[PDB]
Amino acid sequence: DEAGITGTWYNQLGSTFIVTAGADGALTGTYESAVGNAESRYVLTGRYDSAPATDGSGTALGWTVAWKNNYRNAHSATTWSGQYVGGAEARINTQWLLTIGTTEANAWKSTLVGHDTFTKVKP
Amino acid sequence: DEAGITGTWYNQLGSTFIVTAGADGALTGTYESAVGNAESRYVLTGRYDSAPATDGSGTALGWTVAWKNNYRNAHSATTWSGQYVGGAEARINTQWLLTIGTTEANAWKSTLVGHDTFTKVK
Amino acid sequence: DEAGITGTWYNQLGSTFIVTAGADGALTGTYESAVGNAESRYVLTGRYDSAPATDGSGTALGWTVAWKNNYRNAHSATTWSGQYVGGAEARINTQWLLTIGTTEANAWKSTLVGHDTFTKVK
Amino acid sequence: DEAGITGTWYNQLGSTFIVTAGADGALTGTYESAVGNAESRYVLTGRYDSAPATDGSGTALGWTVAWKNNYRNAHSATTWSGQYVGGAEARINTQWLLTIGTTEANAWKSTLVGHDTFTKVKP
């Protein structure tokens, strides 16, 4: 699913995820958030299962964005963990954790959790 | 804190995280898991904030391991999201998500959540 | 929102959530899951914000089911944390944590995470 | 485990959880948070597995606090999901979700995630 995963994806917020899957399990590309303390594109890197099960299971993957580029530094990072489901209406279904750099005193409110669904159609 | 993050880290479960932090915000390295359908080292990649706040805040970072190597394939991937906190007893405090490739029917039970704390001494 | 929350709700999986919101902030009722190791209705209890904000914000709430009843015991419990959003197509949008009783050795794989959206129809 | 769970628990933050485990699987009591937009005690309700496994497994449980009492209203709720481990140093190991009421546009940033360990002794 290297070619299936490679492409331009959008989530339900209208964020843009441009990714290349390599033969070796690498994900590389750019992420542009339509919300939050974010402007323009950010580097992403991650991993996917390059030899997945043949039983109709999805392809396990994940990636990270640290929210620093030449325009903005939000002192935060998001990881997405999910699976690619090919076929009719290909979608990447994810859960994510967004951690913000905090003091020790504030560490209890440092991490947001959510869920993003990506498809190749911009909504 | 490129130097602060670069090196060898251990979690509460006896897993080993070996990481280099690049100047550009890259993380790259290897993870060895002491539990689950894992054996030997796995490639990790991630990102960190290479210019953090200067108010005592931690440094945000994250990484991914897909649980495939030359020996095993667990058809799953973990992401760690967290922050590095420097000082005499340096720590990386994380939460993680572990997704297993599932059918659409079983997707509701595809993702585990937990927390790992990494220190520079076991 | 006592009135808007009280009633029968359905999620995307086919599960049924039957709840009463008290004036005091209580949620009480029964949950019927369409998946997993579950049969018939389970007791649920939770709390909601009985005096929400009036700026168009949702109403925070949460509840717990322990997966024991007179048919099954799956030795597990789920909590849903979310918000009620009123209007034409009312919705309760939630994330959930499902913990299974484990030995200390298996506690890293004790907790699933997911998300459920509940509507008044389906 | 009714006797084991019933009582006062303290987390790493110094918050105080006072709970009664009913014979039927009910949890009722009060929560006082040492952090956040919290003052004094708040009602909690939850459930636990009242017929657990006898293989050395923990006892699954969960509870909810809505952060409104007579004194304050933070327009939020937390749920804790976890398990009770009995013994001389008994523990409740939890993960929690804290949801704040938001507009639909800000719903992506409505939910914090964390972990609390509760013991019988002040930390």
Curated annotation (Swiss-Prot), chains A, D:
Molecular function in Gene Ontology: biotin binding
Motif (Cell attachment site): 47-49
Any Gene Ontology CC annotation: extracellular region
Binding positions for biotin per the UniProt entry: Y31, Y42, W80, W96, W108
Origin superkingdom: Bacteria
Role noted for this protein: The biological function of streptavidin is not known. Forms a strong non-covalent specific complex with biotin (one molecule of biotin per subunit of streptavidin).
Organism: Streptomyces avidinii
Avidin-like domain: residues covered: 2-123
The keyword Hydrolase is annotated on this UniProt entry: no
Keywords: Biotin, Secreted, Signal
Primary location group: secreted
Full-sequence range covered: 38 to 159 of 183
The protein, known as: Streptavidin
Subcellular location: Secreted
SUBUNIT field: Homotetramer.
Membership in a protein family: Belongs to the avidin/streptavidin family.
